[PDB]
Every structure is written in structure tokens, then in C-alpha cells.
């Protein structure tokens, strides 16, 4: 089992780490058919999505996808500082796989 | 896959964007039979709903409909600034498809 | 489709609007068998319930009942001002059908 | 239908009211097998549980039990004043059946 | 039935108590297939996980695992002081079984 987001990311193909050390700039969610997703951006312009659930996901991910959208909403609303995101880069926008938050970390 | 609410809205018929850049003024929710819905207004009278679930909605939307109602309630309570709404304009009040929030975006 | 709580209320038999313009004074919830319900009161003495789910409710209402209890709890804990309640008056206490909140509204 | 926690409590065998008028001192929760429960204590030492779900619970209580655990967590974190608890006194620690909160009530 | 996290811990093999009396330093969560988990750390370098649901877990634990992840996220965001963690020591990082929070306690 990995002990941090960097080592978790390294277990998967087509993933990279983005280091943000920043709060989320915008949050978007949709209930439109076939676009039931969230999108977040950072102030520089970096954009990310939580993918629409689909056949690329296994059953255990269904709940985790819903959790990630809860997490991003509350993070946005509390202006919580996001440390890193693990993403799949074979999607546009990049698709969120994991998130870390560590407000007090010296950078 | 769209990158923002405006491009998202352009994928659908009978939709438009409202640019609000303002907090929600009132939040109403109902459990009454056949009116299981939410209604929000902004200070000068602009009014929106989250539709009662029905045969126009597919199963993948059911969770997202419940999520939107949660988002609107917490936005109302925290006085969070709503940037845009994507709505269907073939309903009255206009029916919410998507929402974006971006507090620090400089308005022009 | 109604655009406000007053118009929504007028659609049903056995309903009325209470205008409170006040925060909730007390919140009570129960997990006891056949009394899985919530009760709120206001400082003016008014008492209301969120009814136990039963045969008088249709399937589409089950989720909304749980949502109403969530909404009343967070309103209570944040001292959110409640504008109006739409209630059924053929139950004692009066059974909540809809709630509206509008902090800045002038009175 | 009862109008308050005291009258609700008196409808059940093996129950009693505790008048606390105080915030929760500690909150404990467990995911360990057969001990999927919550425990709260007050500064006077009073200790209570939200029981592990079981065959003594009817289906309508499962959701209410999960809600009660949500309510206690948020009450703990916001330091909300608990007015009264209704508890089953045939379990040790006594098992929570209902809760009431009423911050502005005189004591 | 145990009345506290220490006595709860002593009912299970391969467990131990960590006393932290400190807020969570970082929170990490993942939706990646087969790594649907959460990881928290403390200032002192100590790292803990909430395990991916699996065949080591009984059905009644599934809801409680999801609840624990909710509790840790909200604790991290509010800077709530964690008192003790009960963990399994036959996993790396140590797997969380229970958590207690008691802000006003004398150390
Ligand atoms: O688990 C979800 C992931 O599934 C992979 O197969 C896909 O390449 C990724 O882009 C992401 O969708
Ligand atoms: O997905 C929900 C939408 O479904 C469409 O068919 C309808 O025209 C819209 O008004 C909206 O109800
Ligand atoms: O939908 C809930 C309502 O159902 C009605 O039939 C009943 O008369 C009301 O008191 C209320 O229970
Ligand atoms: O519904 C839960 C309750 O069920 C009763 O039968 C039992 O005596 C109580 O202690 C409590 O467990
Ligand atoms: O219930 C979860 C636990 O199950 C045990 O059998 C295992 O040894 C622990 O490490 C933990 O996984
Ligand atoms: Cl892979
Ligand atoms: Cl793509
Ligand atoms: Cl009617
Ligand atoms: Cl009884
Ligand atoms: Cl064991």
C-alpha cells in the first residue's frame, strides 16, 4: 500500500502529479444527462474533472467518485489549500484520481 | 468533454447561461407529493428550480439531482457567490442543469 | 410549477403557511421504532414535525423527507432565519411540507 | 404523535431522559467488526452509545441510526449544547434513542 | 460493550492505541481502482490509512468505513484535535479501527 499521493500515482499508467499548493479558484457541477461531472480550475488556468461514471470504472470506484465531488465542493467553499492532485492525462480535462491537502507543510 | 459551464451548456438544446455573480437570496425546498423540488431566487426576482425527478431524467442523473440540491442549500447558507447557472429554458421557472462558482474572478 | 412556497401550498388540501421570520429554537430527532421523526420548535411556542415515513407518502417523497431533516438540522445549528413553513394541518403537531429561507428579505 | 422528547420517551419500555444542558466532551467512532458504533461522553462522566445495528432494529431505524451518528459528530465539532437525551437503560452504556438541542432555553 | 477507545482496542488481536492529542497534518484520498482509500499524517511523521474495503471486512463494516473517511476529512478541515487512534498493526501504514476526539481533556 502506498503511504502518499506520489507513490500512489506511480502505480498507474497515464497519470501525473500536479503540485498546486493553492486553493481552488472555481468549482462547477452539472446534472445534465451524460455530463454528470464536476470541473475545477486554479487561478493560473489549470483545469480538472471528476469523470462521469462509466465503463472505465470498476464498482468500488462509484462511491469514491461521489466522495471526491463532495471533497472538492467543501474544499472550494472553505478555501482549503490543495497540495497535489494525481490525475490521468489521457483525458481532457485531466481526470482526478487522488487529492492531498496539507495546509501547514513548508514548501 | 467540456472545460467550462458555457461550453457544457452549448451541447444541449433549449438551454441558456445566466450570469449572476451574486449570492442566493432565498432557498425553498419541498417534500410535498409530486413537488419534491427546490427553488432559489436572487435579490431582484430571478428564479430557478431543480426539477422534480421524472421520466425526462435518466438514472445517471438521479444522484446528481440530489447533489445539486445539496450544493444550493450550502451555497445559500454560506452566502457563496454564484458565478453562472446553465438552465433549460423550456421550463418555468428555469430548470438548473449546472452551476459554477468562482469567488475571486474579476468581473468586467 | 410554483415559483414560491405560498403558491406551492395553495396546490394542496389541508395546508397552510406559517410565517416565522426567526431561527429554530429547538431541534429534536429520534431513531426509536415507529417514531423515526424530527420535531422543531420556535421561541413563540410553535411546534412542527417531519412525519414518520408511512403509507400516506409516495416513493418520490422518501428522499425528500430525509433531506428535510438534514435541512432543519443544519438550519438549527447555523441559526439560519426561517421565513415560512408550509404545513399539513390535519396532523398534530403540524407536519412540514416545505420550508423557505430568505435572510435579507425586508419586513 | 409526541410533541417533545419527554413524551416520546414515555411511550417506550426501558427508557429514561437525561437532562444534560451541555456540549459533548468526547466523540468516539469505530469501524471494527461487530463494534460499528459511536460513543459520546460528557464532562460529568456520563457515557452513551449509538448501538451497533442488529435484529432488535426494524428496517425503518437503519437510516435513523446513521443520521443519529451524523448528528452527534456535527454536534461534537460545533460544540452545540445538548439539552436532553432519551436512552435505553437496558444496555450499558445506555443506548441513545433520541436527542434534543435547544441553545437559548433557560436552565 | 466497551465505554472507551482503549477498552475497545483490547478486544481485538493485532491492535494498538496511538495517543496523538493533535490535529491532522495532511489528508489524502483516492478514487483510483483498487486504491479507494484515505491516508492521514500527523506532524510527528506518523501515517495512517483507512483501508480499501475488502474480503477482510464483514458487510456491517462497509458503512462504517465510509463514515470514518467522512470523519477524517471533516476533522482535517476544522483542525479538530484527535485524541487517540485505535489501529491494526499488521498493515502498513497502520489501518485505522477507531478514533476518539476530546478537545477539552487535560493531558
Ligand atoms: O479508473 C478510471 C481510469 O480508467 C483508465 O482505464 C483510464 O485510462 C483513465 O483515464 C481513467 O478513466
Ligand atoms: O434532463 C432534464 C431535461 O430533459 C429534457 O428532455 C427537457 O427538455 C428539459 O427541460 C429537462 O427537463
Ligand atoms: O404526503 C404527506 C401528506 O399526505 C396526506 O395524504 C396527509 O393527509 C397529510 O397529512 C400528509 O401526511
Ligand atoms: O430498537 C432498539 C431497542 O430495541 C429494544 O428491543 C431493546 O430493548 C433496546 O435496548 C433497544 O436496543
Ligand atoms: O476488519 C478489518 C481487519 O481485519 C483483520 O482480520 C485484519 O487482520 C486487520 O488488519 C484488518 O484488516
Ligand atoms: Cl494502470
Ligand atoms: Cl477526453
Ligand atoms: Cl392534496
Ligand atoms: Cl416499547
Ligand atoms: Cl480479533
Numbering used by the authors:
A (entry chain G), C (entry chain E), D (entry chain D), E (entry chain H): 1 to 107
B (entry chain F): 1 to 108
Question: Any passages from the paper?
Answer:
Here, we generated a novel vaccine platform, CTB-V2c, by scaffolding a mucosal-targeting, pentameric particle approaching the size of a typical virus-like particle (VLP) from cholera toxin B (CTB) onto the SIV V2c B-cell epitope, favoring an α-helical conformation of V2. An additional study in macaques demonstrated that V1-deleted (ΔV1) SIV envelope immunogens expose the spike-apical V2 region in an α-helical conformation (designated V2c) and elicit anti-V2c Abs mediating potent ADCC and correlating with decreased risk of SIVmac251 acquisition. Significantly, V2c includes peptide positions 164 to 181 (based on HXBC2 strain numbering), which were targeted for immune selection in the human vaccinees of RV144 (25). We hypothesized that V2c, in isolation from the rest of the HIV/SIV envelope, could elicit functional, non-neutralizing Abs that contribute to vaccine efficacy.
Accordingly, we designed a V2c SIVsmE543-based peptide with the sequence DKKIEYNETWYSRD and scaffolded it on cholera toxin subunit B (CTB-V2c). V2c structural analysis predicted the peptide would take an α-helical conformation and suggested its potential to be stable in vivo. We expressed CTB-V2c in E. coli and purified it by galactose affinity chromatography to select for stable CTB pentamers, as these are the only CTB forms that bind to galactose and mucosal GM1 gangliosides. Gel filtration revealed a pure pentameric fraction of this CTB-V2c chimeric vaccine immunogen. Liquid chromatography-mass spectrometry (LC-MS) confirmed the composition of the molecule, and crystallographic resolution of the structure confirmed a pure, stable pentamer with a dynamic C-terminal peptide insert, consistent with a flexible α-helix DKKIEYNETWYSRD peaked six weeks following the first immunization. Taken together, these data suggested that our CTB-V2c vaccine was successfully immunogenic.
